[PDB]
């Protein structure tokens, strides 16, 4: 068995220039989730679950 | 078995430019989830879920 | 058995450009789900299931 | 005599995103004059010439 | 004489987003004038000329 | 006489996000004049010539 493995990528973010001009930004959050705002985010998950920007508001039994 | 990974690429991102001008960004969340704003995001799952921009209200029993 | 993997691209991207001007942007939830502004994601999932900007309102037994 | 400037705006930019993805870029002048790749640029001149992106090759007498 | 400036703007440049993926960039100049690369530049000028990216090969007399 | 100047903004440069990837950049000049790579540049002039990236190649008698 030969596996070569060359320059590859996997999960990869390269390259962003972002601006962001906002005069008021506001979350109100009552008992639940909110995720706002994520940005360049890279991940590579082996045998297992892969989650970036995940929001649940609540479990319950 | 003779396997090549030559430069491959998998959930890759790259060269992203934004600009947002917003005056008033406002976000209210009562027992529930919310997500805004996700940019520029890559990942790699292997034998998982892969969920990025996810979201769910709640879970009940 | 030669697998010859060359330049090979899944789950990419690559030169975005976006400008966003809002005057007001508002969100209100109530024990729901909501997603919004999601821009340049790519992944790869293998053997899971693959969700990028999903939402589900709650569940319930 | 009663001037009132209110919110006014002259030679103004904003709100630009721009991505460029070359592989080669060459440039050979000679005697002569180039000019190349301006973005972005805003000016205001009061009782003179307003030029940007000019170009001459040569003056002679 | 009452002259009432208020927020105003001249020459302004707001709000920029680049991103330059080039592999080469090659510039080859003999006895010229070259202009590359100019990005978000603003100026004013009260009584003069206003150049920004300006080129001239040679004078001569 | 009365001049009220408020918040004015002249030559002004604000929010301004750049990212450059290159793997060669070459410049060779014989006797000329070059610019390159100009970002985020303002200024004001009064009773004056206001030149921002300027190149000239020779000046001769």
Chains 1, 2, 3, 4, 5, 6 share one sequence.
């Not at 596996?3 to 979350?27: D, R």
């Amino acid at each position: 068995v030969l596996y070569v493995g060359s320059k590859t990528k996997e999960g990869v973010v390269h390259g962003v220039a972002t601006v962001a001009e906002k005069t008021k930004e506001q979350v109100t959050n009552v008992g639940g989730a909110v995720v706002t705002g994520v940005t360049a985010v890279a991940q590579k998950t082996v045998e297992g679950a892969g989650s970036i920007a995940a929001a649940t508001g609540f479990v319950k039994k």
